[PDB]
Amino acid sequence: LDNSYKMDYPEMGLCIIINNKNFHKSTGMTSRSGTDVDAANLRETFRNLKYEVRNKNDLTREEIVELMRDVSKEDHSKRSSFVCVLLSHGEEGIIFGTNGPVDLKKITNFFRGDRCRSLTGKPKLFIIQACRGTELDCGIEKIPVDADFLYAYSTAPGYYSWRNSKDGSWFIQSLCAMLKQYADKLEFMHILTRVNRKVATEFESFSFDATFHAKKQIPCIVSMLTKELYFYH
Amino acid sequence: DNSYKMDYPEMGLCIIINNKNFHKSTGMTSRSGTDVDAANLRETFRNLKYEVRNKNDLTREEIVELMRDVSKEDHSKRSSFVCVLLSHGEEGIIFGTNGPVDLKKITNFFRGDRCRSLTGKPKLFIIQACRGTELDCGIEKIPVDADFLYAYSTAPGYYSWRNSKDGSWFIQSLCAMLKQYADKLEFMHILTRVNRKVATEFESFSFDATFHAKKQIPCIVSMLTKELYFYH
Protein backbone atom coordinates (compact mmCIF):
# COMPACT_ATOMS: atom_id res chain seq x y z
CA LEU A 1 0.00 0.00 0.00
CA ASP A 2 2.07 2.84 -1.47
CA ASN A 3 -0.86 5.11 -0.45
CA SER A 4 1.29 7.49 1.57
CA TYR A 5 4.70 9.17 1.30
CA LYS A 6 7.70 7.51 2.97
CA MET A 7 8.73 9.76 5.91
CA ASP A 8 11.45 7.62 7.53
CA TYR A 9 14.40 8.86 5.50
CA PRO A 10 17.35 9.55 7.82
CA GLU A 11 16.27 13.26 7.98
CA MET A 12 12.70 14.70 7.73
CA GLY A 13 14.11 17.54 5.63
CA LEU A 14 14.87 21.19 6.04
CA CYS A 15 12.44 23.95 6.87
CA ILE A 16 13.30 27.33 5.38
CA ILE A 17 11.47 30.15 7.15
CA ILE A 18 11.75 33.50 5.42
CA ASN A 19 10.60 36.15 7.82
CA ASN A 20 10.20 39.64 6.25
CA LYS A 21 9.48 42.37 8.81
CA ASN A 22 10.89 45.71 7.55
CA PHE A 23 10.59 47.20 4.07
CA HIS A 24 12.60 49.92 2.23
CA LYS A 25 11.47 53.57 2.05
CA SER A 26 11.22 52.89 -1.69
CA THR A 27 8.37 50.39 -1.23
CA GLY A 28 6.27 52.56 1.03
CA MET A 29 5.19 49.33 2.73
CA THR A 30 4.52 49.17 6.48
CA SER A 31 6.29 47.06 9.12
CA ARG A 32 4.80 43.67 9.56
CA SER A 33 4.23 43.63 13.30
CA GLY A 34 3.60 40.22 14.92
CA THR A 35 5.76 38.19 12.53
CA ASP A 36 8.63 37.59 14.95
CA VAL A 37 6.14 35.62 17.08
CA ASP A 38 5.18 33.44 14.04
CA ALA A 39 8.83 32.81 13.10
CA ALA A 40 9.39 31.67 16.69
CA ASN A 41 6.23 29.54 16.75
CA LEU A 42 7.22 27.91 13.42
CA ARG A 43 10.80 27.24 14.50
CA GLU A 44 9.73 25.50 17.71
CA THR A 45 6.86 23.59 16.04
CA PHE A 46 8.99 22.41 13.14
CA ARG A 47 11.91 21.35 15.30
CA ASN A 48 9.46 19.15 17.21
CA LEU A 49 8.52 17.56 13.90
CA LYS A 50 12.32 17.14 13.45
CA TYR A 51 12.96 19.53 10.51
CA GLU A 52 16.31 21.19 10.04
CA VAL A 53 15.00 24.73 10.57
CA ARG A 54 16.81 27.78 9.15
CA ASN A 55 15.51 31.27 9.93
CA LYS A 56 16.31 34.01 7.43
CA ASN A 57 15.09 37.53 8.21
CA ASP A 58 14.32 40.62 6.13
CA LEU A 59 15.53 39.30 2.77
CA THR A 60 15.64 41.24 -0.52
CA ARG A 61 13.81 40.08 -3.62
CA GLU A 62 17.25 39.06 -4.88
CA GLU A 63 18.24 37.36 -1.64
CA ILE A 64 14.94 35.38 -1.67
CA VAL A 65 15.89 33.97 -5.09
CA GLU A 66 19.51 33.24 -4.25
CA LEU A 67 18.60 31.45 -1.04
CA MET A 68 16.02 29.43 -2.96
CA ARG A 69 18.51 28.69 -5.74
CA ASP A 70 21.06 27.11 -3.33
CA VAL A 71 18.74 25.00 -1.24
CA SER A 72 17.52 23.52 -4.55
CA LYS A 73 21.08 22.52 -5.51
CA GLU A 74 21.68 20.77 -2.15
CA ASP A 75 21.46 16.97 -1.96
CA HIS A 76 18.06 16.09 -0.41
CA SER A 77 18.65 12.37 -0.83
CA LYS A 78 18.65 11.57 2.88
CA ARG A 79 15.64 13.87 3.41
CA SER A 80 11.95 12.82 3.52
CA SER A 81 10.60 16.18 2.35
CA PHE A 82 11.10 19.94 1.87
CA VAL A 83 9.24 22.77 3.65
CA CYS A 84 9.40 26.50 3.13
CA VAL A 85 7.47 29.31 4.83
CA LEU A 86 7.16 32.80 3.32
CA LEU A 87 6.06 35.53 5.71
CA SER A 88 5.58 39.04 4.31
CA HIS A 89 3.22 41.41 2.42
CA GLY A 90 1.78 40.10 -0.82
CA GLU A 91 -0.54 40.21 -3.84
CA GLU A 92 -2.00 37.34 -5.96
CA GLY A 93 0.97 35.25 -7.09
CA ILE A 94 3.56 37.46 -5.41
CA ILE A 95 5.47 37.80 -2.12
CA PHE A 96 7.45 40.90 -1.22
CA GLY A 97 11.13 40.98 -0.38
CA THR A 98 12.32 43.97 1.66
CA ASN A 99 13.00 45.96 -1.54
CA GLY A 100 10.44 44.57 -4.02
CA PRO A 101 8.01 41.97 -5.40
CA VAL A 102 8.96 38.35 -6.22
CA ASP A 103 6.73 36.06 -8.26
CA LEU A 104 5.88 32.95 -6.24
CA LYS A 105 6.38 30.78 -9.34
CA LYS A 106 10.02 31.94 -9.64
CA ILE A 107 10.85 30.61 -6.19
CA THR A 108 8.93 27.35 -6.54
CA ASN A 109 10.31 26.38 -9.92
CA PHE A 110 13.78 25.88 -8.46
CA PHE A 111 12.17 22.85 -6.89
CA ARG A 112 10.27 21.32 -9.85
CA GLY A 113 10.73 17.56 -10.21
CA ASP A 114 13.13 18.16 -13.12
CA ARG A 115 15.34 20.87 -11.48
CA CYS A 116 15.90 19.33 -8.08
CA ARG A 117 16.31 15.66 -8.77
CA SER A 118 16.93 14.76 -5.12
CA LEU A 119 13.41 15.95 -4.19
CA THR A 120 11.61 14.13 -7.06
CA GLY A 121 8.63 12.13 -5.78
CA LYS A 122 8.73 13.71 -2.28
CA PRO A 123 6.42 16.37 -0.76
CA LYS A 124 7.47 20.01 -1.40
CA LEU A 125 5.51 22.09 1.12
CA PHE A 126 5.06 25.81 0.78
CA ILE A 127 3.29 27.62 3.57
CA ILE A 128 2.42 31.17 2.51
CA GLN A 129 1.38 33.84 4.97
CA ALA A 130 0.76 37.02 2.91
CA CYS A 131 -1.99 38.98 1.15
CA ARG A 132 -3.31 37.64 -2.14
CA GLY A 133 -5.13 40.88 -2.87
CA THR A 134 -7.23 43.37 -0.89
CA GLU A 135 -10.74 41.94 -0.92
CA LEU A 136 -12.04 41.78 2.67
CA ASP A 137 -14.45 39.02 3.67
CA CYS A 138 -17.54 40.30 5.54
CA GLY A 139 -18.57 36.84 6.71
CA ILE A 140 -22.17 35.77 7.33
CA GLU A 141 -24.29 34.68 10.33
CA LYS A 142 7.55 9.24 -15.17
CA ILE A 143 5.56 11.82 -13.14
CA PRO A 144 4.49 15.48 -13.71
CA VAL A 145 7.14 18.05 -12.80
CA ASP A 146 4.47 20.06 -10.99
CA ALA A 147 3.43 17.03 -8.82
CA ASP A 148 4.27 16.55 -5.10
CA PHE A 149 3.75 20.22 -4.34
CA LEU A 150 1.29 21.53 -1.84
CA TYR A 151 0.60 25.21 -1.28
CA ALA A 152 -0.92 26.13 2.09
CA TYR A 153 -2.16 29.67 1.60
CA SER A 154 -3.22 31.76 4.63
CA THR A 155 -6.17 33.32 2.66
CA ALA A 156 -8.59 32.66 -0.23
CA PRO A 157 -7.37 33.97 -3.66
CA GLY A 158 -7.78 37.75 -3.96
CA TYR A 159 -8.03 38.43 -0.24
CA TYR A 160 -6.37 40.22 2.62
CA SER A 161 -4.57 38.06 5.23
CA TRP A 162 -5.00 39.11 8.86
CA ARG A 163 -2.10 39.37 11.26
CA ASN A 164 -2.21 40.13 14.97
CA SER A 165 0.52 42.19 16.67
CA LYS A 166 0.61 40.09 19.87
CA ASP A 167 -0.34 36.57 18.76
CA GLY A 168 1.18 36.62 15.27
CA SER A 169 -0.92 35.91 12.15
CA TRP A 170 -4.23 34.14 12.59
CA PHE A 171 -3.02 31.52 10.10
CA ILE A 172 0.46 30.67 11.34
CA GLN A 173 -0.87 30.79 14.89
CA SER A 174 -3.53 28.17 14.06
CA LEU A 175 -1.28 26.02 11.93
CA CYS A 176 1.32 25.63 14.68
CA ALA A 177 -1.38 24.99 17.21
CA MET A 178 -2.91 22.34 14.97
CA LEU A 179 0.34 20.53 14.10
CA LYS A 180 1.33 20.61 17.78
CA GLN A 181 -1.99 18.87 18.47
CA TYR A 182 -2.24 16.39 15.58
CA ALA A 183 1.10 15.87 13.81
CA ASP A 184 1.36 12.49 15.56
CA LYS A 185 -2.12 11.27 14.54
CA LEU A 186 -3.87 12.86 11.46
CA GLU A 187 -2.82 13.08 7.79
CA PHE A 188 -1.63 16.58 6.72
CA MET A 189 -4.73 17.42 4.63
CA HIS A 190 -6.84 16.71 7.67
CA ILE A 191 -4.64 18.87 9.88
CA LEU A 192 -4.94 21.72 7.33
CA THR A 193 -8.73 21.23 7.22
CA ARG A 194 -8.68 21.67 11.06
CA VAL A 195 -6.58 24.77 10.52
CA ASN A 196 -9.28 26.12 8.15
CA ARG A 197 -12.18 25.73 10.63
CA LYS A 198 -10.06 27.24 13.36
CA VAL A 199 -9.24 30.37 11.36
CA ALA A 200 -12.76 30.52 9.93
CA THR A 201 -14.61 30.29 13.24
CA GLU A 202 -12.37 31.48 16.10
CA PHE A 203 -11.09 34.73 14.54
CA GLU A 204 -12.72 38.02 13.57
CA SER A 205 -11.12 41.41 13.04
CA PHE A 206 -11.29 44.44 15.34
CA SER A 207 -11.05 48.08 14.23
CA PHE A 208 -12.41 51.53 15.02
CA ASP A 209 -12.80 51.82 11.25
CA ALA A 210 -16.08 50.02 10.29
CA THR A 211 -14.52 49.21 6.86
CA PHE A 212 -11.85 46.99 8.54
CA HIS A 213 -14.05 45.74 11.38
CA ALA A 214 -15.62 42.29 11.92
CA LYS A 215 -13.74 40.95 8.90
CA LYS A 216 -13.41 37.23 8.32
CA GLN A 217 -10.89 34.89 6.65
CA ILE A 218 -10.52 31.38 5.22
CA PRO A 219 -7.16 29.79 4.42
CA CYS A 220 -6.71 28.09 1.06
CA ILE A 221 -5.19 24.61 0.68
CA VAL A 222 -3.81 23.94 -2.80
CA SER A 223 -2.62 20.38 -3.21
CA MET A 224 -1.04 18.64 -6.16
CA LEU A 225 0.24 15.90 -3.84
CA THR A 226 -0.05 12.26 -4.92
CA LYS A 227 -0.02 10.62 -1.48
CA GLU A 228 -1.23 10.86 2.09
CA LEU A 229 1.21 12.69 4.33
CA TYR A 230 2.00 11.69 7.94
CA PHE A 231 4.65 13.29 10.13
CA TYR A 232 5.27 9.97 11.89
CA HIS A 233 5.93 6.44 10.63
CA ASP B 1 -17.92 18.84 15.11
CA ASN B 2 -15.33 17.20 12.83
CA SER B 3 -16.97 16.19 9.54
CA TYR B 4 -19.86 17.67 7.57
CA LYS B 5 -23.38 16.59 8.35
CA MET B 6 -24.30 14.52 5.26
CA ASP B 7 -27.58 13.05 6.61
CA TYR B 8 -30.20 15.58 5.35
CA PRO B 9 -33.34 14.26 3.57
CA GLU B 10 -31.22 14.70 0.36
CA MET B 11 -27.54 14.78 -0.68
CA GLY B 12 -28.21 17.71 -2.99
CA LEU B 13 -28.07 18.64 -6.63
CA CYS B 14 -25.32 17.92 -9.09
CA ILE B 15 -25.60 20.26 -12.07
CA ILE B 16 -23.28 19.20 -14.92
CA ILE B 17 -22.62 21.74 -17.71
CA ASN B 18 -21.23 19.76 -20.64
CA ASN B 19 -20.26 21.84 -23.71
CA LYS B 20 -19.52 19.87 -26.91
CA ASN B 21 -20.34 22.16 -29.91
CA PHE B 22 -19.29 25.80 -30.18
CA HIS B 23 -20.33 28.76 -32.37
CA LYS B 24 -18.74 29.34 -35.78
CA SER B 25 -17.86 32.88 -34.62
CA THR B 26 -15.50 31.52 -31.93
CA GLY B 27 -12.81 29.50 -33.72
CA MET B 28 -13.31 27.04 -30.82
CA THR B 29 -13.30 23.43 -32.00
CA SER B 30 -15.83 20.87 -30.82
CA ARG B 31 -14.97 18.89 -27.70
CA SER B 32 -15.06 15.29 -28.98
CA GLY B 33 -15.99 12.52 -26.57
CA THR B 34 -17.02 14.88 -23.78
CA ASP B 35 -20.40 13.12 -23.56
CA VAL B 36 -18.41 10.08 -22.30
CA ASP B 37 -17.44 12.11 -19.20
CA ALA B 38 -20.93 13.62 -18.88
CA ALA B 39 -22.41 10.15 -18.75
CA ASN B 40 -19.73 8.61 -16.54
CA LEU B 41 -20.25 11.53 -14.16
CA ARG B 42 -24.06 11.34 -14.11
CA GLU B 43 -24.07 7.62 -13.32
CA THR B 44 -21.53 8.17 -10.52
CA PHE B 45 -23.15 11.05 -8.61
CA ARG B 46 -26.53 9.33 -8.96
CA ASN B 47 -24.98 6.39 -7.06
CA LEU B 48 -24.06 8.93 -4.40
CA LYS B 49 -27.78 9.75 -4.27
CA TYR B 50 -27.35 13.18 -5.89
CA GLU B 51 -30.22 14.84 -7.82
CA VAL B 52 -28.21 15.06 -11.06
CA ARG B 53 -29.05 17.71 -13.66
CA ASN B 54 -27.55 17.45 -17.14
CA LYS B 55 -27.19 20.45 -19.41
CA ASN B 56 -25.63 20.49 -22.89
CA ASP B 57 -24.17 23.23 -25.09
CA LEU B 58 -25.05 26.25 -22.92
CA THR B 59 -24.11 29.79 -23.96
CA ARG B 60 -22.37 32.02 -21.44
CA GLU B 61 -25.69 33.74 -20.73
CA GLU B 62 -27.44 30.42 -20.29
CA ILE B 63 -24.71 29.33 -17.84
CA VAL B 64 -24.83 32.50 -15.74
CA GLU B 65 -28.62 32.29 -15.79
CA LEU B 66 -28.80 28.60 -14.84
CA MET B 67 -26.52 29.14 -11.87
CA ARG B 68 -28.48 32.19 -10.67
CA ASP B 69 -31.70 30.12 -10.59
CA VAL B 70 -30.16 27.02 -8.95
CA SER B 71 -28.61 29.34 -6.34
CA LYS B 72 -32.06 30.91 -5.80
CA GLU B 73 -33.60 27.53 -4.97
CA ASP B 74 -34.14 26.31 -1.44
CA HIS B 75 -31.33 24.01 -0.32
CA SER B 76 -32.46 23.56 3.37
CA LYS B 77 -33.15 19.81 3.06
CA ARG B 78 -29.94 19.29 1.08
CA SER B 79 -26.56 18.18 2.53
CA SER B 80 -24.11 19.60 -0.07
CA PHE B 81 -23.96 21.02 -3.59
CA VAL B 82 -22.04 19.88 -6.66
CA CYS B 83 -21.51 21.60 -9.99
CA VAL B 84 -19.46 20.00 -12.78
CA LEU B 85 -18.06 22.01 -15.71
CA LEU B 86 -16.83 20.28 -18.88
CA SER B 87 -15.53 22.76 -21.45
CA HIS B 88 -12.67 24.80 -23.02
CA GLY B 89 -11.07 27.21 -20.55
CA GLU B 90 -8.26 29.54 -19.62
CA GLU B 91 -7.02 30.44 -16.18
CA GLY B 92 -10.08 31.49 -14.18
CA ILE B 93 -12.59 31.14 -16.99
CA ILE B 94 -14.54 28.38 -18.67
CA PHE B 95 -16.12 28.75 -22.08
CA GLY B 96 -19.76 28.95 -22.97
CA THR B 97 -20.59 27.94 -26.56
CA ASN B 98 -20.70 31.57 -27.65
CA GLY B 99 -17.80 32.74 -25.44
CA PRO B 100 -16.08 33.19 -22.05
CA VAL B 101 -17.25 33.36 -18.38
CA ASP B 102 -15.29 34.31 -15.26
CA LEU B 103 -15.55 31.28 -13.00
CA LYS B 104 -15.78 33.64 -10.05
CA LYS B 105 -18.93 35.00 -11.74
CA ILE B 106 -20.61 31.60 -11.57
CA THR B 107 -19.39 30.66 -8.05
CA ASN B 108 -20.16 33.97 -6.35
CA PHE B 109 -23.77 32.91 -6.73
CA PHE B 110 -23.25 30.42 -3.87
CA ARG B 111 -21.18 32.50 -1.48
CA GLY B 112 -22.41 32.00 2.07
CA ASP B 113 -24.08 35.45 1.95
CA ARG B 114 -26.00 34.90 -1.32
CA CYS B 115 -27.29 31.34 -1.08
CA ARG B 116 -28.19 31.48 2.59
CA SER B 117 -29.54 27.90 2.70
CA LEU B 118 -26.07 26.54 1.71
CA THR B 119 -24.14 28.19 4.52
CA GLY B 120 -22.20 25.53 6.43
CA LYS B 121 -22.67 23.07 3.58
CA PRO B 122 -19.94 21.86 1.20
CA LYS B 123 -19.92 23.47 -2.22
CA LEU B 124 -17.96 21.40 -4.80
CA PHE B 125 -16.86 22.52 -8.27
CA ILE B 126 -15.15 20.02 -10.45
CA ILE B 127 -13.49 21.65 -13.41
CA GLN B 128 -12.38 19.72 -16.46
CA ALA B 129 -10.98 22.48 -18.67
CA CYS B 130 -7.76 24.15 -19.76
CA ARG B 131 -6.15 26.59 -17.31
CA GLY B 132 -3.64 27.77 -19.94
CA THR B 133 -1.42 26.16 -22.61
CA GLU B 134 1.75 24.96 -20.90
CA LEU B 135 2.50 21.25 -21.38
CA ASP B 136 4.13 19.25 -18.56
CA CYS B 137 7.23 17.47 -19.83
CA GLY B 138 7.45 15.34 -16.71
CA ILE B 139 10.45 13.61 -15.22
CA GLU B 140 11.69 10.07 -14.43
CA LYS B 141 -20.20 34.14 11.86
CA ILE B 142 -18.11 32.42 9.16
CA PRO B 143 -16.30 33.59 5.96
CA VAL B 144 -18.48 33.96 2.91
CA ASP B 145 -15.72 32.19 0.97
CA ALA B 146 -15.61 29.20 3.40
CA ASP B 147 -16.92 25.69 2.69
CA PHE B 148 -15.92 25.72 -0.95
CA LEU B 149 -13.83 23.14 -2.80
CA TYR B 150 -12.56 23.18 -6.38
CA ALA B 151 -11.35 20.01 -8.01
CA TYR B 152 -9.47 21.25 -11.08
CA SER B 153 -8.29 18.80 -13.78
CA THR B 154 -4.89 20.63 -14.07
CA ALA B 155 -2.34 22.87 -12.39
CA PRO B 156 -2.63 26.62 -13.04
CA GLY B 157 -1.24 27.56 -16.43
CA TYR B 158 -1.54 24.12 -17.94
CA TYR B 159 -3.39 22.36 -20.69
CA SER B 160 -5.77 19.50 -19.79
CA TRP B 161 -5.72 16.22 -21.66
CA ARG B 162 -8.70 14.33 -22.87
CA ASN B 163 -9.16 11.06 -24.70
CA SER B 164 -12.01 11.25 -27.25
CA LYS B 165 -13.01 7.59 -26.75
CA ASP B 166 -12.17 6.93 -23.10
CA GLY B 167 -12.94 10.39 -21.66
CA SER B 168 -10.71 12.97 -19.95
CA TRP B 169 -7.81 11.66 -17.86
CA PHE B 170 -9.23 13.54 -14.86
CA ILE B 171 -12.95 12.79 -15.07
CA GLN B 172 -12.26 9.21 -16.04
CA SER B 173 -10.14 9.02 -12.84
CA LEU B 174 -12.49 10.90 -10.50
CA CYS B 175 -15.39 8.58 -11.36
CA ALA B 176 -13.18 5.51 -11.10
CA MET B 177 -11.87 6.63 -7.74
CA LEU B 178 -15.20 7.78 -6.31
CA LYS B 179 -16.80 4.53 -7.47
CA GLN B 180 -14.18 2.63 -5.49
CA TYR B 181 -13.65 4.73 -2.34
CA ALA B 182 -16.57 7.08 -1.76
CA ASP B 183 -17.49 4.69 1.08
CA LYS B 184 -14.09 4.18 2.70
CA LEU B 185 -12.07 7.38 2.39
CA GLU B 186 -12.65 11.03 3.11
CA PHE B 187 -13.07 13.18 -0.09
CA MET B 188 -9.61 14.84 0.20
CA HIS B 189 -8.01 11.40 0.14
CA ILE B 190 -10.08 10.21 -2.85
CA LEU B 191 -8.91 13.32 -4.65
CA THR B 192 -5.34 12.57 -3.57
CA ARG B 193 -5.79 9.13 -5.17
CA VAL B 194 -7.07 10.89 -8.28
CA ASN B 195 -3.84 12.88 -8.35
CA ARG B 196 -1.74 9.72 -8.14
CA LYS B 197 -3.80 7.99 -10.77
CA VAL B 198 -3.81 10.78 -13.34
CA ALA B 199 -0.23 11.48 -12.40
CA THR B 200 1.19 7.97 -12.93
CA GLU B 201 -1.13 6.07 -15.25
CA PHE B 202 -1.56 8.56 -18.13
CA GLU B 203 1.01 9.77 -20.66
CA SER B 204 0.35 11.73 -23.89
CA PHE B 205 0.96 10.27 -27.36
CA SER B 206 1.89 12.11 -30.55
CA PHE B 207 3.86 11.60 -33.74
CA ASP B 208 5.08 15.17 -33.16
CA ALA B 209 7.55 15.57 -30.26
CA THR B 210 5.86 18.80 -29.13
CA PHE B 211 2.81 16.81 -27.96
CA HIS B 212 4.54 13.57 -27.09
CA ALA B 213 4.86 11.96 -23.64
CA LYS B 214 3.22 14.81 -21.70
CA LYS B 215 2.08 14.41 -18.10
CA GLN B 216 -0.69 16.01 -16.06
CA ILE B 217 -1.32 16.64 -12.34
CA PRO B 218 -4.82 17.77 -11.25
CA CYS B 219 -5.08 20.37 -8.50
CA ILE B 220 -7.25 20.27 -5.34
CA VAL B 221 -8.26 23.69 -3.97
CA SER B 222 -9.94 23.35 -0.54
CA MET B 223 -11.66 25.95 1.63
CA LEU B 224 -13.64 23.34 3.54
CA THR B 225 -13.50 23.45 7.33
CA LYS B 226 -14.67 19.89 7.95
CA GLU B 227 -14.05 16.40 6.57
CA LEU B 228 -16.43 15.11 3.95
CA TYR B 229 -17.79 11.56 3.78
CA PHE B 230 -20.28 10.45 1.20
CA TYR B 231 -21.42 8.04 3.93
CA HIS B 232 -22.27 8.01 7.71
Curated annotation (Swiss-Prot), chain B:
Gene Ontology terms: cellular component: cytoplasm; cytosol; death-inducing signaling complex; glutamatergic synapse; neuronal cell body; nucleoplasm; nucleus; postsynaptic density
Pfam families cross-referenced by the UniProt entry: Peptidase_C14
S-nitrosocysteine found at: C130
Location of (Microbial infection) ADP-riboxanated arginine modifications: R162
Membrane-spanning intervals of the chain: none
Principal location class: cytoplasm
Expressed in which tissues: Highly expressed in lung, spleen, heart, liver and kidney. Moderate levels in brain and skeletal muscle, and low in testis. Also found in many cell lines, highest expression in cells of the immune system.
Post-translational modifications: Cleavage by granzyme B, caspase-6, caspase-8 and caspase-10 generates the two active subunits. Additional processing of the propeptides is likely due to the autocatalytic activity of the activated protease. Active heterodimers between the small subunit of caspase-7 protease and the large subunit of caspase-3 also occur and vice versa.
Catalytic activity reported: Strict requirement for an Asp residue at positions P1 and P4. It has a preferred cleavage sequence of Asp-Xaa-Xaa-Asp-|- with a hydrophobic amino-acid residue at P2 and a hydrophilic amino-acid residue at P3, although Val or Ala are also accepted at this position
E.C. number: 3.4.22.56
Residues of the active site: H88, C130
Record InterPro entries: Caspase-like_dom_sf, Caspase_cys_AS, Caspase_his_AS, Pept_C14, Pept_C14_caspase, Pept_C14_p10, Pept_C14_p20, Pept_C14A
Localization, UniProt: Cytoplasm
Molecular function terms, GO-annotated: aspartic-type endopeptidase activity; cyclin-dependent protein serine/threonine kinase inhibitor activity; cysteine-type endopeptidase activity; death receptor binding; enzyme activator activity; peptidase activity; phospholipase A2 activator activity; protease binding
Stated regulation of activity: Inhibited by isatin sulfonamides. Inhibited by BIRC6; following inhibition of BIRC6-caspase binding by DIABLO/SMAC, BIRC6 is subjected to caspase cleavage, leading to an increase in active caspases.
Assigned keywords, A-Z: Acetylation, Apoptosis, Cytoplasm, Hydrolase, Phosphoprotein, Protease, S-nitrosylation, Thiol protease, Ubl conjugation, Zymogen
GO biological process, alphabetically ordered: anterior neural tube closure; apoptotic process; apoptotic signaling pathway; axonal fasciculation; B cell homeostasis; cell fate commitment; cellular response to staurosporine; DNA damage response
Matching SMART domains: CASc (SM00115)
Similarity comment: Belongs to the peptidase C14A family.
Subunit structure: Heterotetramer that consists of two anti-parallel arranged heterodimers, each one formed by a 17 kDa (p17) and a 12 kDa (p12) subunit. Interacts with BIRC6/bruce.
Function: Thiol protease that acts as a major effector caspase involved in the execution phase of apoptosis. Following cleavage and activation by initiator caspases (CASP8, CASP9 and/or CASP10), mediates execution of apoptosis by catalyzing cleavage of many proteins. At the onset of apoptosis, it proteolytically cleaves poly(ADP-ribose) polymerase PARP1 at a '216-Asp-|-Gly-217' bond. Cleaves and activates sterol regulatory element binding proteins (SREBPs) between the basic helix-loop-helix leucine zipper domain and the membrane attachment domain.
Protein name: Caspase-3
Underlying gene: CASP3
